[PDB]
Each structure stands twice: as structure tokens, then as C-alpha cells.
Amino acid sequence: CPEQDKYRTITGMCNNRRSPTLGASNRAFVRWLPAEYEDGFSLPYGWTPGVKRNGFPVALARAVSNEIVRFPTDQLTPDQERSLMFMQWGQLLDHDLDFTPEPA
Amino acid sequence: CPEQDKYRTITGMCNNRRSPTLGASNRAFVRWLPAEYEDGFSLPYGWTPGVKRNGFPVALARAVSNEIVRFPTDQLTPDQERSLMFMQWGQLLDHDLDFTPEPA
Amino acid sequence: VNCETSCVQQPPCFPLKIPPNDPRIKNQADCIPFFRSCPACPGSNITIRNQINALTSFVDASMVYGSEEPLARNLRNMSNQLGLLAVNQRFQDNGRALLPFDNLHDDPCLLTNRSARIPCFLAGDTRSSEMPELTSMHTLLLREHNRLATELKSLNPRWDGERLYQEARKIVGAMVQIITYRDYLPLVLGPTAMRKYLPTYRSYNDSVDPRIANVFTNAFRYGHTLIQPFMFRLDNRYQPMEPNPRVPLSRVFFASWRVVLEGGIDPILRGLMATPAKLNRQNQIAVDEIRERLFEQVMRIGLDLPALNMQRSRDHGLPGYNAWRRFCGLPQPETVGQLGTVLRNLKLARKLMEQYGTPNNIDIWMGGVSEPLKRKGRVGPLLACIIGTQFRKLRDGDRFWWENEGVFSMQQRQALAQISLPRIICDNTGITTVSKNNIFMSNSYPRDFVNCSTLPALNLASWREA
Amino acid sequence: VNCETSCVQQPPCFPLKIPPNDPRIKNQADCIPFFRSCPACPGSNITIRNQINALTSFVDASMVYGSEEPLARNLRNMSNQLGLLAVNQRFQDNGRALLPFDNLHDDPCLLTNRSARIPCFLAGDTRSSEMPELTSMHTLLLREHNRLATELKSLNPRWDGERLYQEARKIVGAMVQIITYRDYLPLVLGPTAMRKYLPTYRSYNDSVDPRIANVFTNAFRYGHTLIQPFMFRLDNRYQPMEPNPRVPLSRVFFASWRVVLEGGIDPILRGLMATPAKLNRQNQIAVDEIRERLFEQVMRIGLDLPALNMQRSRDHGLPGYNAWRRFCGLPQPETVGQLGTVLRNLKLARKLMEQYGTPNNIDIWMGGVSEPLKRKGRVGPLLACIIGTQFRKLRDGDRFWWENEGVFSMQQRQALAQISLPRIICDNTGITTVSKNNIFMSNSYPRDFVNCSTLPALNLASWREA
């Protein structure tokens, strides 16, 4: 890292000079808690038929969505004190913070 | 990880049910602070000629040892309140907790 | 295995299985397409799998400028020394700039309307065309960059292209920081969580880890609960701009053709300002436009965003609800009764227990959006903790935070404190009537609106080198 | 390549550079051998390099049993159902067991006495032969395991080999935990740091991360400052065991032949009990037996252990002194005067600044061992914090912690509370006079010593399966 600079690098490299990749692009996320995988290190819960998580069957994500998230659209409650711009800035800001690559 | 068990595994696997590799052998150390490398991710300080650390030259480990650690052996001070067994249990205990492999 | 076209579970695919009596997908041999997030250390039998952030974690407008050097250069106009970002060379919006088009192998945007042949847009981030409302914001900021570089070029004749670009990018970055921390976050967290997780800024702390935490990538998706089932478009007197004022969201995803051929960004920006967001209620969590018909036009089957969020948290090995509560110093309910008390909702607690068996296994997004919203906030305690903790690190651990001594002059900070999203809209669009601050609260025209003429523009006089 | 035989800095080598005018290595272009620790994710251009722990982090006597299954099985006597650990088939120590020999490629132990032809020992951990005193402790615990299994077999005739081995192993692991937390750690940390970092055990907490932290691998090396320049050996009357009761350490490293051919483990164990450890003082940090002549008999030149500790911390990317002081909630000295105040030694502070320039760059081991020792402890505040924090996690985060509900019965716990290192020595050697508790403080014969006959045996009654 340059002893002195004037602006942010595009990658974020060198913002933190003692640990130059912190906050920079194409780096692993920090973990606030240890990961919880079916085999301890790689497989996602729900991967292996019959394998429970902490004593209980893994619920299908689509099942949880159907049972808890699904609701009749006519019941929608317009937020009297937030604009749709509140939603949109959220998405825009998220896209300044993180993008998690997947294989094509 | 079995639902129940009566003894430790040899590898330490499954000691922690939710994250079964925690404390198990042949796993990365946990970091209490982000690593500090010359290039931010791999090269150790002292690797590249002329690369300073935080504004100062990297002190040779051997120079620090010579100028700060070296002392006259006949000046050695016996610890009136500790046995050499205190030293030995420390090494024995260390060997229960960690061994950092290197290529042969 | 092609994750898009096969339901076979093999690396790197993790398709969502279909439950019996599904309301839309009666064929249980089908599935919802899912690709596992790229592993930071592929094929390792030593590391605990982790995922990758392809962007800079800092609030630095990287969605405008790019987070990698090749892209960042390609987004720039190098034909001259003006320090501008490149604009669309084939289309304009009422005489104003559109984002340049991107060059993708299998452009999804083309599939949203075959005869229009409008590809996806090119921007600092790969998702600018995902919805026209997001595209409008990227376009707005692109215009503000060029507007700033132009004024700067008048104040400082000697400044070359590189200097103008960096100075304009630095102002835009501060703008995103100010809008986010001054106007947005207080309305996300509520006053109590705001004071607790984001105490008054002091200065840069190089011991504050600024990285995005893996959990944040799933927790911040709380915003999915705010999504309305339509894209609303209004004319210059804020009335339903016919013939299609309320387009179903399932026909706007990647619909870049709508920005180019259906009136530009003004109708869209006015719709965002004059329409309420959806409120998150415990039995009105997320609409079917995203739960049933996500990306329906651009792939073999409609996705389910809430379901993808839960499958993603498992893909990423994220701990369950109680583990995150414990992390945050919040009580961890063990019974349906205790969960009911935490949720102030026994009925939801029962549905959750029936699905998960224990609150220990509730997926982080599901648990987080299930909690009652904090007073004057739009998330509960758990998400407030995760989101507030993330944003304090992004602020305190940023050497280029706009308020850090040395980044801007005292007079420069005074000038920047006058910026607002409504003013930026006034400066870069054909809209002359905009929301009264705070823009994230105002949502009712004309009660909550004012003329642009009444809003002081950003004063760049303290940027003069003289 | 071979980092042991060349000074080329190329993967996987990171040779220590030699300062001008070194008092030993006169050719300034030469070096001290050093191999980088294996990376967790080899060759990665995404991950921040990290190192690997090959052992179980738990205090579970893995140095006896092994941390990998094939090894664990190879350490066991599989020729019967007595659940014993295999013992040397070629040599005995006055009728008592010795560890079996290992089968290494470039066996270092053979090099220490070419004519004796005694190879290194095989144990749960690869370093058992590093010094005879360490070998003696390994041998002691192997005997204790076999002794336990034998008594358990008399108590429970129906118990098979697997059961006997597991029950004996469980007791041995408990013994290591008790001696460590009851007798050893209080004397390392001092009463004040013991109470702060190791408050009374309440229960197993499945949210406590039990992994060893990278910094601990370096910080726990504070023990190098305790090392005496000789291996002391004493006869049954605790008098110098002639012809050589004081062997320079540079001639005992990997000297397994001395255990086999120079009197067994009794003279070694006696020397450890009745000889003082070296006291760490600010101008007497570590001896030349390890600073100039480490492994002299098995390397091209003597290594420097203090210097290796510092090169290792850099190999490991460990933050400097002040970052660790900050982590520990301790004040961070920024000038020579401030460091002088923290170290209560301006002379040492000045020396550190001449070498490092800033306290931000002092290597963790060097800064750690430089601090004045806590009252009735042998580490300063920084090392107390790192060491105390680590041992709390190993205790609270261990599902098999000896006091954890369901591991042992109440009556078993009462019996285990009576174990002691002096008693274990009495049970497995020809020594009949041992130190008074605490063995780690007692160091002067005959003052601090008592008859084995005054110390009761571990009562195994409660292991009888009713």
C-alpha cells in the first residue's frame, strides 16, 4: 500500500493499511459466528435425505414460504409513513455493499 | 454426529453439535484479529526487500533476539517459587492443544 | 448438472424441493432453481466453507463506479479530459443520459420483450437492470457524477480528467453515505436501535473490521418485505401515467426496455416518491409477485424469493434464529409459548414451531422478519442488531468516511450537509416537484411535496483550488 | 529446495536473515532455517492465508492418544482385550513401560547419538522426543493409562478392550484438565488474572468457540523463558546422578537414547521436581542453549528459538504488540516514554524502540514476554489476557469438560478431585519421595518433599458398574 494516497482505490484495497484486503472486493465474508453445515464444513442443511438439524427435520424452504410468508395480496397494508423510495434505496445500498457470486 | 455418545471422538469431531469441526484436528486456527501480511493476504513481513511495516523497517528476528533476548548465562536467576516441572507441564500441555504443520 | 434446467441435486446445484399440495407447483418432480454460492476455497477438506463478496463493503458508491479496475475503467468516458462516466450512445431520456448497455452472453433483459431488443444496462454493479426502479437510481447517480464533474471543471480549470473523476466520485460517495446514515438508517432501525448501534461518530478507527459479515447478506434482505406488487408510474402532475401506470412486478424484472421506451426515469422516480412502501406485518410478510413469480419472464419457472433467502442461509451455513439472538444479547425462546411472547404473536409462533420444531432452527431471514417492528423502525430487535452492528463497522472502519478528519475540509462538510436525495432528483431529471425531506417518510402528494426551486443546491465553492 | 539446507527465499521457505556482525553467523548472506507453516487454503488468491492446527484443541490428553484415528489405533495394544496402549517391545525402564519406537524418514533422534541407534518415540503427538523431560511426561501418562485400564478390568471383569481403553482415556483426560486448571494455570496467570479470565465454571456452553486462536500458538511460547540450560538428573536420594547429573540442553534435544540407555525416566522426573525453573526477567529473557544452540545436533547450524518465535508470528500474519494490547482492553503505549511506563523499564522500552521503531510493530512474543510479571504469576497483562481467554474457551466450550453435567458421576467427580501429579508419579515410577502440592511451586529437596506413602491412591470404587 502507498505510504500516501488521495482517493479510494476501486477495489477497496489499502483502506485498512494494517490489513489491506479488509473491505476490498473478491474476498471472503467475515464470520460473526462459526458456520453450521450438515457435515460440519461444507454441505447445507437439507442436502442429505433424513439428516436432521439439532434434533429436528429440516423444513423445505418452499414449505416455510407457503405456510408462513404467503398471504392474499388484497390484505396488503400500505405503509403510511414510508415511501416506496425507502424500499428502493435499500436495494441500491445493498448493491453498494455485497454481491455473492455463483457459477454460471 | 450421533444423537448421543459417551466418549470423545479421537479427532474432536462432534464435540460441538451445531458446528462439529470446532476444536477438531486438521482445521484452520480461529483468528481473534485479522491477519497482517505484506500484500494483505499471504506474504510475511520481511519477505520483500524494502517493504516497510507501518512506516518502519521490519526488524530482523535474529537482530531482536541478539539485542534484546541475549543475556549472560551465569546471570540466570533460579525461580525460588517454581519448579522446572512448571516449565515441563507447559510444553506437555501445549502439545495437547496445538501443532502447526509444516512441509517436510 | 445445469441448475437452471435440471432438478438433480449435484454440485453446484442445490434445487429447492417442492412440498405436497403446493399452491402453484403441483408437480413435485419440479423444483426451484438454485446455484450454490461460490466457495472461497474450492474443494478444500480443511477449511470450513465460506462465501465471497465481489464488491467493496464500504459505502463508496461502488454500484456506480465498479469494484474491479477493468470495469471501473470501462464505465469511464476516456474520450476526453472531463472525468465523466460513459453514457448510452444509442438512447436518451428526454435529452438526458441513460446508462450504457452491457454486453452479456445470455442477456435476461432481452427476454423481457423480444421485439424491443433492449439489453441490460452496464453499471458499477451487475444488477442495475433487475428492476426499472433500481435502474432509475443508478441512472440518477450517473447523471449526478457528470453534473458534479462539469461544475468542478468550471471552478478548477487546471484539474485534468482523472482529478475531476475522482473528485466527483468522492462527492457522490459522500452523498450515498449521508443519505444512508442521516435519512435511511434511522427509519430502518428506529430511534432506540439507532442510538444504541450507531452512536455519534468520533473518527476513523483502524481496528474496526469493515468487512461485510456473512449473516448480513441474508439479514439485510429484510427489504424484501417492503416490496409492493407493482411498479407505479406517474406523470408531471403525479397522476397515473397511462396506459400502464401499475405494472405487475413479474413483468418489470430485467425490463430495461421500459426505461428506454416507456418514458425514461422521471415517471418511475415520481412513483417511488408518491407511493407508500408495503408494510411488513406478521401475516403479510412478502407478496406473491416475488414469492410466486420472481423472474418469471426470464427463465423456465417463477422463483420464490423468501424461499431462496432461506435456502441461501443454509447454503452459507448460517446459524439459526436463537444463535443469532444469543449473539445479539437477546433472550432465546425455547418453547412455542416463549417464542409467542418474543413475537407478541402466538399464531405465528405455532406456525414457526410446526415448520422448524425448535426456534433454534428458524432460518435467520424468516426469524428476523417475523419479529414485531421496533417503534418508528421497520425491523425487530434481531435484525436491528445485525444491521446496526454492520453499518457502525462500515462507518467507523472506513478511512475515507466523509466525516473523518482529513477527508473533507470543515467548509466542505458544511456544504455536503445540505445534500438530499430530493435535491439530486431536482438536479438530474425533468421533475420540478419533489418530496419534502425526509424522502423515505414522505409518500403522499401533494401534502408531502415541494417545488425544487425551494431546495438549496450543493455549493461547490469550497472545492475551488484558487 | 529443502529449507534446512539452503538460504534461498522461495516457497515454502522463509529463512531468517542475519544481521551484520552477528556474534555466531559471521557470513551475513547466510541464514537460520525456516519453513512456512502450511496454509489452510493452498495457493489461494482469495483467502487471507491462515495456518492449521493438526491437534484437537480440547484438553483431552490427545498428546497421549493421538488426534487422528489411524494413529490412535496404532498407539493401542490390539493383541488383547485389556484396552492398553502399546509399549516398547525392545526396552524397559527398570521393569516399567517405555513408549514404542516410531518409524520416521529422516529420524532426528538417531542423529543425536549415531552409535546408540535409538530412534524417536511414537506417541499421540509427534514431538514426544523433543527433550527427555517431555518424553518422561509422555511415558508417565502412558503408564497411568495402562495402570487405570488394569484396575478398571479388575473392578469390571465384563468390560471389553474398547470399554477399558475409553474409560481409562476419559480419566487421563480429566487428570490433565484438573492438574492444568487447578494447579498450573493459577501459577501462570496470578490470582487476579485467574479470577478475571477463569471465573467459576457454571456449565457447558455450546456457543463458546473452543478452537485454538492463531495468536495463542505464539503467545503460549512464553514458556521458553522458563527453560533452564541443562537437563538435571537425580538419584533416589535426590542427589546428583553421576557421572553426568547436568546435561547441556543442546545435547538432549531428540536424545531418546538417553531415556533408554541412561537410567530411564525416574532421574529425569526427580530433576524436574527438585530444580527451580528459570525466572523470566527483563534483562534475562531466554538462554543461549535455545537462542544459539537449539537442535545443534540435528541441524546444519544451531537454531534460535526466540528468533524463530518472531519469524513465526510474521509467517502467521499476527498483528503487532499494540493491536493485541487493544484487543485485550489494555492501554497502547505510542512513545518510548509510554512503553517505559507500561514495562516499568525505560531501558528495555528504549531497546525495543531502537529495534522496532514503533510499539505497533513489536512482535507479540517479544512484547508479551517483555512485560513485568503479574503478582504470583509468570506472565504480564497481555499474555495473561491471551492465555486466560484461550483456556476459558477450552473449558466452557468443551462438551466433555470433567465437571460438565453427565460426563462423570458426582461420586466420580469427588474421587477425581483427589488426583495429583505427585500421586501419578508415585503410581508409575520407582520414585518414593515426591513434591508436596503444589508440584509447580515446590522445588527444593528435602524441604518441599514428602513420602509417596502419605498420599492416597485415586479411589476407583465409583467406576464399578453396579
Ligand SMILES: *[C@@H]1O[C@H](CO[C@@H]2O[C@@H](C)[C@@H](O)[C@@H](O)[C@@H]2O)[C@@H](O[C@@H]2O[C@H](CO)[C@@H](O[C@@H]3O[C@H](CO[C@H]4O[C@H](CO)[C@@H](O)[C@H](O)[C@@H]4O)[C@@H](O)[C@H](O[C@H]4O[C@H](CO)[C@@H](O)[C@H](O)[C@@H]4O)[C@@H]3O)[C@H](O)[C@H]2NC(C)=O)[C@H](O)[C@H]1NC(C)=O
Ligand atoms: C455462552 O457463551 C457465549 C459466548 O460468550 C463469550 O465467551 C465466553 C467464554 C465468556 O467469556 C463470555 O463473557 C463471552 O461473551 C455468550 O454469548 C455472547 O454473549 C455476549 C453478551 O450478550 C454477546 O455480546 C454482545 O454482542 C452483540 C453483537 O456484537 C458482538 O459481535 C460483533 C461482531 O464480532 C462485535 O463487533 C461486537 O463488539 C460484539 O462482540 C453486541 O450488540 C452487544 O453489545 C451491545 O449490547 C450491550 C448490552 O446492552 C452493551 O453493553 C454494548 O455497549 C452494546 O450496546 C454485546 O457485545 C456475544 O455476541 C455472544 N457471543 C456468541 C458467540 O453468541 C452467551 O451469553 C453464553 N451463555 C451463557 C448461558 O453463559
Ligand SMILES: *[C@@H]1O[C@H](CO[C@@H]2O[C@@H](C)[C@@H](O)[C@@H](O)[C@@H]2O)[C@@H](O[C@@H]2O[C@H](CO)[C@@H](O[C@@H]3O[C@H](CO[C@H]4O[C@H](CO)[C@@H](O)[C@H](O)[C@@H]4O)[C@@H](O)[C@H](O[C@H]4O[C@H](CO)[C@@H](O)[C@H](O)[C@@H]4O)[C@@H]3O)[C@H](O)[C@H]2NC(C)=O)[C@H](O)[C@H]1NC(C)=O
Ligand atoms: C477501536 O475499535 C475497536 C473495536 O471495537 C468494536 O467495534 C466497534 C465498531 C465498536 O462497536 C466497539 O464497541 C467494539 O468493541 C476497539 O477495540 C476493542 O476494544 C474492546 C474493549 O477494550 C475489546 O474487548 C475486550 O476484549 C478482550 C478480549 O476478548 C475479546 O475477544 C474474545 C475472542 O474473540 C471474545 O471471546 C471475548 O468475548 C472478547 O470479545 C476481553 O478480555 C475484554 O473483556 C474483559 O475485560 C472487561 C473490562 O475489564 C470485562 O468487563 C470483561 O468481563 C472481561 O474481563 C474486552 O471484552 C475488543 O476485543 C477490542 N477489539 C479490537 C479489534 O481490538 C477499540 O477500543 C476502539 N478504539 C477507539 C479509540 O475507539
Ligand code: HEM
Ligand atoms: C426489485 C426488488 C428486488 C429484487 C428483484 C431482489 C432480488 C433478489 C435476488 C434474486 C436475490 C438472490 C436470492 C438468492 O439467494 O438466490 C436477492 C438478494 C439480496 N437482496 Fe433482494 N431484491 C430486491 C430488493 C431488495 C431490497 C429492497 C433489499 C434491501 C433493503 C434487498 C437486499 C438483498 C441482499 C442484501 C441480497 C444479497 C446480495 C448478495 O449477493 O450478497 N433486496 N434479492
Ligand code: HEM
Ligand atoms: C524442551 C523445551 C522446548 C523446546 C525444545 C521447544 C521447541 C520449540 C520449537 C522448535 C518450536 C517451533 C519454533 C518455530 O516456530 O519454528 C516451538 C513452538 C512452540 N512452543 Fe516451544 N519448546 C520447548 C518448551 C516450550 C514450553 C515450556 C512451552 C510452553 C509453556 C512451549 C510452547 C510452545 C508452543 C505453544 C509452540 C507452538 C506449537 C505449534 O506448532 O502450534 N514450548 N517450541
Ligand SMILES: *[C@@H]1O[C@H](CO)[C@@H](O)[C@H](O)[C@H]1NC(C)=O
Ligand atoms: C464522452 O463525452 C463527450 C462529451 O460529453 C460525449 O460527446 C461522448 O458521447 C462521451 N462518450 C461516451 C462513450 O459516453
Ligand SMILES: *[C@@H]1O[C@H](CO)[C@@H](O)[C@H](O)[C@H]1NC(C)=O
Ligand atoms: C415490447 O416492446 C414494443 C416496442 O418494441 C412495444 O410496442 C410492446 O408494447 C412491448 N410488449 C409488451 C408486451 O409490452
Ligand SMILES: *[C@@H]1O[C@H](CO)[C@@H](O)[C@H](O)[C@H]1NC(C)=O
Ligand atoms: C500387549 O499386552 C500384552 C499383555 O499386557 C503384552 O504382553 C504385550 O507386550 C503388549 N503388546 C504391545 C505392543 O504393547
Ligand SMILES: *[C@@H]1O[C@H](CO)[C@@H](O)[C@H](O)[C@H]1NC(C)=O
Ligand atoms: C552414545 O551412546 C553410547 C551407548 O550406546 C554411550 O556409551 C556413549 O557415551 C554415547 N555418546 C555420548 C557422546 O554420550
Ligand SMILES: [Ca+2]
Ligand atoms: Ca461498496
Ligand SMILES: [Ca+2]
Ligand atoms: Ca487436545
Ligand SMILES: [Cl-]
Ligand atoms: Cl456470519
Ligand SMILES: [Cl-]
Ligand atoms: Cl489470532
